[PDB]
Amino acid sequence: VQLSGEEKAAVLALWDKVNEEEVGGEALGRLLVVYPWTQRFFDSFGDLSNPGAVMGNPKVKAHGKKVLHSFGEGVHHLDNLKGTFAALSELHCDKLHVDPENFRLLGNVLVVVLARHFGKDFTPELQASYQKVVAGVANALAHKYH
Amino acid sequence: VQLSGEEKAAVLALWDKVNEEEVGGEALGRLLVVYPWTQRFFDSFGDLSNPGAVMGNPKVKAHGKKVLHSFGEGVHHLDNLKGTFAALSELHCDKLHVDPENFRLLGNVLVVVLARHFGKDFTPELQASYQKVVAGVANALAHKYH
Amino acid sequence: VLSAADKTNVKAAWSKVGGHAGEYGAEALERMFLGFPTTKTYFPHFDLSHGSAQVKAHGKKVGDALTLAVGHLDDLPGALSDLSNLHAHKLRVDPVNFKLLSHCLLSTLAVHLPNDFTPAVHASLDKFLSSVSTVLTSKYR
Amino acid sequence: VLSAADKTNVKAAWSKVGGHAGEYGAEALERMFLGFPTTKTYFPHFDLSHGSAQVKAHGKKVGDALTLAVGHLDDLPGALSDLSNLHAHKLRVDPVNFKLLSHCLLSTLAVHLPNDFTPAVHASLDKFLSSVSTVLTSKYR
Ligand code: HEM
Ligand code: HEM
Ligand code: HEM
Ligand code: HEM
């Protein structure tokens, strides 16, 4: 799902300034807090009682980083999203049994976070690009479902 | 999205006894009544004020029949859902601008209706088959979206 | 968000269900376990086999809770306050699973009361069910 | 379904917004019109150009309605009863569009109050917004 020539140039231009370890760790924590039912898939991470326990949890900072790294592998191969997420699809579908509506959520939170971090440089136009460059990842991940 | 060898045989075996004109006319009417915001796409059909005006409306009985015929064309070509709905996809997406969550709805209502009609022969196992043979049509229709 | 005539529709529709509520919640459950397998996740300790006396058992639990809410529509938050804690605080069930059981419940009723399941009763029951789905998933603590 | 501490979070979070509510609803709108084009459908009579004085105008309409609901959380159905009729009875807006404007609204706040937009305030505002989205789309008539 290609955005455009000019758009795309600006999309990869932002990802360079993206600080993985922090952006991804706040995105997962934000998801566990706002939509508390997803906490159920991460019991082995330990204590997630309140927002303080969750943000400061090490496993969450760790795992959050890997999820963020996975997005980057998508922000680049925009042309092959359905083969770049082929295996992950199989893990989240038949193995973990996660509902696809959650891929959605994490996607938008990842965006609400990119907003808080880059401020006025995250222009409504840029946000528009990311909104698709996110929705595509959400769809690839649900493909190898049936 | 193939179901199975034994399943499939039973799926086509039910569609033979399906009475198009009525099954499809009650399915559209049911949708306009339960989720009243879809009424917005059919203003040229006339009066849809209440459930009585809608069920007895001619355009709804007519159009409902065509939608039902379209499903059948899916219940058969289960192997080529994304090429069998290729054009419809283009109509409902960039032309009409219908949200994909509605394809979902009409799908389940089509099922709630098949239940009321065939009673105890619509076994939970059969319903399970139809639940996918419906979800696939819903997905094909959203494919040529982006 | 239940209107005046939605209430009446509900109270009356559930009187036709009568004493099969238990039976129906059991069959509505079985339909969900086969059509949406992702749900067998919240039930690892159960016997999900077709004639399971555990499902029949739970079904009853479910049907009864509903008949309970039908008698207290003017304050569902007050009457289900405990089931809300169980499903939102303890079990942490995904709210999308609620739309599925509701759908399977409505499919059962169509099979058993084809003549009472009028379009208007369909619209009310769907909304009533949604109210119940909203309460049970709200952590107001 | 708003808890006790969700209410406090909301009342306090909206006091920090202060008098920019108008400004924010305008920018939240602009973000939606560019990211989710399917929405320009409900606005054919408007000038959707970037500096549109029509959007700035409507934005205000929207921001004010919100500040209105913040002062009546204990009965949103009573205070928005007219907006509920306009968006559900007359305009017949698809409810999925509500999740979008809410999301764009939350994106705006992050850009302008990066230090007050704490995760806990995020969870409350999201719920508060959902309550409002539910009211405006319910035909209780
Ligand atoms: C839609 C975006 C998502 C992406 C890109 C994504 C990506 C990933 C990645 C990269 C891994 C690690 C695989 C490995 O280490 O071999 C993973 C694991 C996992 N994901 Fe996701 N995920 C997403 C959403 C979700 C959601 C919403 C849930 C929550 C229900 C979920 C639950 C899990 C769990 C529990 C694991 C196992 C972690 C472990 O034990 O190593 N994922 N995901
Ligand atoms: C997901 C299942 C659906 C299927 C299989 C389907 C199929 C069709 C078919 C076969 C046609 C006729 C095309 C022709 O005559 O050339 C059509 C037209 C149309 N559909 Fe759908 N449709 C579906 C859902 C929807 C939904 C949920 C909406 C409501 C928002 C919608 C709105 C329309 C409209 C307004 C037309 C134009 C009718 C006319 O003026 O001829 N469809 N659809
Ligand atoms: C209208 C919807 C629902 C109602 C009326 C309802 C009602 C109930 C009741 C009455 C109980 C507790 C009875 C007791 O204390 O023994 C219960 C337990 C349970 N429910 Fe629900 N429930 C609903 C939907 C769901 C959904 C959507 C799920 C998830 C798919 C779910 C999962 C469970 C689980 C796992 C238990 C505990 C079983 C056990 O350990 O014994 N429920 N439910
Ligand atoms: C929090 C959500 C929303 C609030 C607070 C809200 C509030 C308002 C208010 C106050 C008005 C009427 C003002 C007047 O009487 O002049 C209005 C009008 C309108 N709203 Fe919204 N609205 C919301 C969401 C939406 C959504 C999601 C859509 C659809 C994308 C929408 C579409 C419209 C339209 C088309 C009008 C009429 C414009 C005109 O003809 O002047 N609104 N809204």
Side-chain angles (χ1 to χ4, degrees), chain A, chain B, chain C residues 1-140, chain D residues 1-140:
Chain A
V1 286
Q2 83 223 310
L3 339 328
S4 163
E6 200 212 307
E7 290 183 53
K8 187 187 184 189
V11 165
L12 302 187
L14 191 60
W15 202 253
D16 274 4
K17 296 183 286 294
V18 178
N19 182 352
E20 289 220 40
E21 211 188 313
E22 305 208 285
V23 161
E26 171 179 353
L28 207 70
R30 246 81 158 61
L31 184 76
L32 288 192
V33 176
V34 186
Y35 313 104
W37 56 81
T38 55
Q39 271 172 38
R40 182 166 181 297
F41 293 85
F42 307 88
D43 273 318
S44 59
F45 277 20
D47 191 16
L48 303 167
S49 293
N50 61 93
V54 176
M55 302 313 299
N57 188 307
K59 293 262 180 89
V60 180
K61 228 105 151 294
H63 183 68
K65 190 186 179 229
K66 293 185 182 182
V67 180
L68 209 289
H69 200 61
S70 198
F71 272 81
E73 291 244 39
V75 174
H76 284 109
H77 299 54
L78 287 172
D79 280 8
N80 190 184
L81 262 32
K82 295 191 175 62
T84 289
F85 288 76
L88 283 183
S89 178
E90 197 171 68
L91 175 94
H92 288 67
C93 304
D94 339 306
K95 294 301 302 70
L96 300 178
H97 302 298
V98 179
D99 199 282
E101 170 71 52
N102 295 289
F103 306 135
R104 267 318 188 160
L105 306 188
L106 181 75
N108 282 320
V109 177
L110 195 185
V111 176
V112 151
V113 163
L114 286 179
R116 193 180 77 81
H117 281 260
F118 291 95
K120 282 194 170 183
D121 301 327
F122 200 63
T123 57
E125 305 98 63
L126 187 66
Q127 176 169 178
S129 290
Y130 268 88
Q131 287 290 182
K132 2 183 185 177
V133 179
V134 113
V137 178
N139 288 312
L141 250 166
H143 210 107
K144 264 286 286 290
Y145 224 95
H146 31 69
Chain B
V1 287
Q2 83 223 309
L3 339 328
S4 163
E6 200 211 307
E7 291 182 53
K8 188 188 184 189
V11 165
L12 302 186
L14 191 60
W15 202 253
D16 274 5
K17 297 183 286 293
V18 179
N19 181 352
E20 291 220 44
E21 212 188 312
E22 305 208 284
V23 161
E26 171 180 352
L28 206 70
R30 246 78 159 63
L31 182 77
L32 289 189
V33 175
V34 185
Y35 313 104
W37 56 81
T38 56
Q39 270 171 40
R40 182 167 182 296
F41 294 85
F42 307 87
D43 272 318
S44 59
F45 278 19
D47 193 15
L48 302 170
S49 292
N50 60 93
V54 175
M55 302 314 295
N57 189 307
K59 292 263 180 89
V60 181
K61 226 105 153 294
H63 183 69
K65 189 185 179 231
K66 292 185 182 181
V67 180
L68 209 289
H69 200 61
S70 197
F71 272 80
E73 291 244 39
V75 174
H76 285 108
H77 299 55
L78 286 172
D79 281 7
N80 189 184
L81 262 30
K82 295 191 176 62
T84 290
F85 288 76
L88 282 184
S89 176
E90 197 172 68
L91 175 94
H92 289 67
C93 305
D94 339 306
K95 294 301 302 70
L96 300 178
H97 302 298
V98 180
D99 200 285
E101 171 71 52
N102 294 288
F103 307 134
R104 253 342 175 150
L105 306 187
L106 181 75
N108 282 318
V109 177
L110 196 185
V111 177
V112 151
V113 162
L114 286 180
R116 194 180 76 82
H117 282 261
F118 290 95
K120 282 194 169 182
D121 300 326
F122 199 62
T123 58
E125 305 98 63
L126 187 65
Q127 174 168 179
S129 290
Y130 268 89
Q131 287 289 183
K132 4 182 183 178
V133 180
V134 114
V137 178
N139 287 312
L141 250 167
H143 210 106
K144 264 286 285 290
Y145 224 95
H146 32 69
Chain C
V1 298
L2 276 197
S3 177
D6 281 299
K7 294 179 175 178
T8 30
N9 281 184
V10 176
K11 277 174 173 180
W14 205 253
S15 69
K16 304 199 184 173
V17 155
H20 301 315
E23 262 185 298
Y24 296 168
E27 188 197 308
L29 276 170
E30 183 184 1
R31 284 177 184 279
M32 174 180 79
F33 287 88
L34 287 182
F36 312 82
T38 321
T39 66
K40 296 179 173 174
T41 283
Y42 298 71
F43 296 91
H45 50 301
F46 276 28
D47 175 11
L48 290 64
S49 63
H50 291 50
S52 178
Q54 218 158 316
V55 177
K56 296 185 72 69
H58 189 65
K60 203 77 186 60
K61 229 68 187 175
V62 178
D64 270 351
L66 285 167
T67 297
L68 181 275
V70 178
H72 298 63
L73 292 104
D74 281 1
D75 196 32
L76 290 180
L80 310 182
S81 183
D82 51 273
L83 259 38
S84 145
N85 277 58
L86 173 60
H87 296 69
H89 289 282
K90 234 112 201 219
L91 297 160
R92 296 173 310 185
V93 183
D94 197 301
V96 168
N97 288 300
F98 276 102
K99 307 201 217 176
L100 308 183
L101 176 47
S102 276
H103 170 61
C104 287
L105 189 52
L106 292 178
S107 300
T108 299
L109 286 118
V111 171
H112 296 289
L113 307 174
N115 295 315
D116 300 277
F117 205 69
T118 75
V121 191
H122 192 191
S124 298
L125 274 154
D126 172 84
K127 298 186 179 185
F128 157 61
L129 277 169
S130 292
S131 309
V132 169
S133 289
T134 279
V135 168
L136 300 213
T137 41
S138 292
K139 289 223 283 200
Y140 358 6
Chain D
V1 297
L2 277 197
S3 178
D6 282 299
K7 296 179 174 177
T8 29
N9 281 184
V10 176
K11 276 173 174 177
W14 206 254
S15 68
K16 303 198 185 171
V17 155
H20 301 316
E23 262 185 298
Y24 296 170
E27 188 197 307
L29 276 168
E30 184 183 0
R31 283 180 186 277
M32 174 180 77
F33 286 90
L34 287 182
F36 313 82
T38 320
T39 66
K40 295 178 174 176
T41 284
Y42 297 72
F43 296 92
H45 50 301
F46 276 28
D47 175 10
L48 290 65
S49 64
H50 290 50
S52 178
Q54 218 157 316
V55 177
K56 296 184 73 68
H58 188 66
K60 203 78 187 59
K61 229 68 187 176
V62 177
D64 270 351
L66 284 168
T67 295
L68 181 273
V70 178
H72 299 63
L73 291 104
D74 282 2
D75 197 32
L76 291 180
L80 310 182
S81 182
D82 51 274
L83 257 39
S84 146
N85 277 59
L86 174 59
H87 296 69
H89 289 283
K90 233 111 201 218
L91 299 160
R92 297 172 309 186
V93 184
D94 196 302
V96 168
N97 289 299
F98 276 102
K99 307 203 217 175
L100 308 184
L101 175 48
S102 277
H103 169 62
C104 290
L105 188 53
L106 292 178
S107 297
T108 300
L109 285 117
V111 171
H112 296 289
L113 308 173
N115 295 316
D116 300 277
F117 204 70
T118 74
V121 191
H122 193 190
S124 297
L125 274 154
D126 173 84
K127 298 187 180 184
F128 157 62
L129 275 167
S130 292
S131 307
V132 169
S133 289
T134 279
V135 169
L136 300 211
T137 43
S138 293
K139 289 223 282 200
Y140 337 21

